[PDB]
Amino acid sequence: GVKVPRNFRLLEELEEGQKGVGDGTVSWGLEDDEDMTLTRWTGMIIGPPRTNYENRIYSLKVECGPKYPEAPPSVRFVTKINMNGINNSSGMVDARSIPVLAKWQNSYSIKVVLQELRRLMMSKENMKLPQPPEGQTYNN
Amino acid sequence: AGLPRRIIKETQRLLAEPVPGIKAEPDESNARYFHVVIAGPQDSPFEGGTFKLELFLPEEYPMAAPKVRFMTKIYHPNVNKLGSICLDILKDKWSPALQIRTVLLSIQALLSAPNPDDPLVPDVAEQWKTNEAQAIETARAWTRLYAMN
C-alpha cells in the first residue's frame, strides 16, 4: 500500500493540469508559479450547457493543505455563482454539501473536485437558479 | 510484510554511514520518503548555505528512478522555480544498479558544476551563459536570502 507523499502527488497533478484532461471543460494550475509548497491552485469550470451557468467561465481557488490528499482541499469560487453548497456572499464551498468533499477519499484530486462541481451544476436544484450578472467576483 | 531488502538496507546505510555534506531524516509517516539537507559545495556560490531536498522511493524502485526535488529556492540553470532537478540519472539514464548515495552526490556535483548549455530553465541559463559573473553573484545572493536559516 505505497503512499505517494503530498508534494509528489501535487507534482503529478501539476503535470496533468498542464496536459489537460477530457474535453477541457475543467482546468487547474498553480496560482503562483514559484510556490514550492504547491498549496494554492486556480481552478476553472466551464458552466455546462442547458443550465443558467452556460457560456460562463468560473474561476475558483483551491487550497491543498499539509494533509492533502489524505484530507480534502478547501475550495472557493472567485466568480460569483448561485449554487447549492456555495456560500452566496463569500463563494466558500461548504464541504458537507458537496459529496466529493463530504466523503473525501485519498484517491481524489483537484480534477475530481472540479468535475464534481461541474456535474452538480447540472442538478435540477441548481440548473434553474437565477444567476448574478456575469463577470462579478467575491471579495478577498 | 515490510519493505524490500534493498530499501531496508539503503534506508539504513544512510544513518550508519552519512554521505559527506548531506544529512537525511526519515519522514514521520512514510517509510519511503526522506527529508534531505545538502550543504552548498566547497568553492561554489552555494557554499555556506544548506538546501532542503525531498526524496521518495516509488513502488517500482529500483526499476523506477527515485523522485527528488529541492524545497529551498536556488538560482541554478538546472533547477527550476519549483525545485525540479534536471539530471540525466533521474530520468532516462536511471538504472537499478545506481544507488541513493550516488544520486545525492550527483546532485552535489550539479551544484558544483552548473550546466548552462543544456539548461532546464532558459532564463537562468541565458544569464549563466551570457553573464556568468553576474549569475554566480545572483546564486550567492539567493544563498544568502534563502539557504542560511
Swiss-Prot record, chain A:
GO terms, biological process: DNA double-strand break processing; error-free postreplication DNA repair; positive regulation of double-strand break repair; positive regulation of protein K63-linked ubiquitination; postreplication repair; protein K63-linked ubiquitination; protein polyubiquitination; protein ubiquitination
Keywords carried by this UniProt record: Acetylation, Ubl conjugation pathway
UniProt key word Acetylation: yes
Keyword Acetylation: yes
Domain of life, per lineage: Eukaryota
Upregulating conditions: Up-regulated in cultured fresh blood cells upon treatment with vitamin D3.
Family stated for the protein in its record: Belongs to the ubiquitin-conjugating enzyme family.
Role played: Has no ubiquitin ligase activity on its own. The UBE2V2/UBE2N heterodimer catalyzes the synthesis of non-canonical poly-ubiquitin chains that are linked through 'Lys-63'. This type of poly-ubiquitination does not lead to protein degradation by the proteasome. Mediates transcriptional activation of target genes. Plays a role in the control of progress through the cell cycle and differentiation. Plays a role in the error-free DNA repair pathway and contributes to the survival of cells after DNA damage.
Protein name: Ubiquitin-conjugating enzyme E2 variant 2
Taxonomic source organism: Homo sapiens (Human)
Curated annotation (Swiss-Prot), chain B:
EC number(s) from the headed UniProt entry: 2.3.2.23
Residue(s) carrying N6-acetyllysine: 81
Location within or outside the cell: Nucleus; Cytoplasm
Domain of life: Eukaryota
Enzyme class: transferase
Entry comment on modification after translation: Conjugation to ISG15 impairs formation of the thioester bond with ubiquitin but not interaction with UBE2V2.
Domain named UBC core: residues: 2-148
SMART domains: UBCc
One Gene Ontology biological process: positive regulation of canonical NF-kappaB signal transduction
Active site per the UniProt annotation: 86 (glycyl thioester intermediate)
Pathway in which this enzyme or protein is active: Protein modification; protein ubiquitination
Record note on quaternary structure: Heterodimer with UBE2V2. Interacts (UBE2V2-UBE2N heterodimer) with the E3 ligase STUB1 (via the U-box domain); the complex has a specific 'Lys-63'-linked polyubiquitination activity. Interacts with RNF8 and RNF168. Interacts with RNF11. Interacts with the E3 ligases, HLTF and SHPRH; the interactions promote the 'Lys-63'-linked polyubiquitination of PCNA upon genotoxic stress and lead to DNA repair. Interacts with ARIH2 (via RING-type 2). Interacts with OTUB1; leading to inhibit E2-conjugating activity. Interacts with GPS2; leading to inhibit E2-conjugating activity.
Described function: The UBE2V1-UBE2N and UBE2V2-UBE2N heterodimers catalyze the synthesis of non-canonical 'Lys-63'-linked polyubiquitin chains. This type of polyubiquitination does not lead to protein degradation by the proteasome. Mediates transcriptional activation of target genes. Plays a role in the control of progress through the cell cycle and differentiation. Plays a role in the error-free DNA repair pathway and contributes to the survival of cells after DNA damage.
Listed name of the protein: Ubiquitin-conjugating enzyme E2 N
Gene responsible for this protein: UBE2N
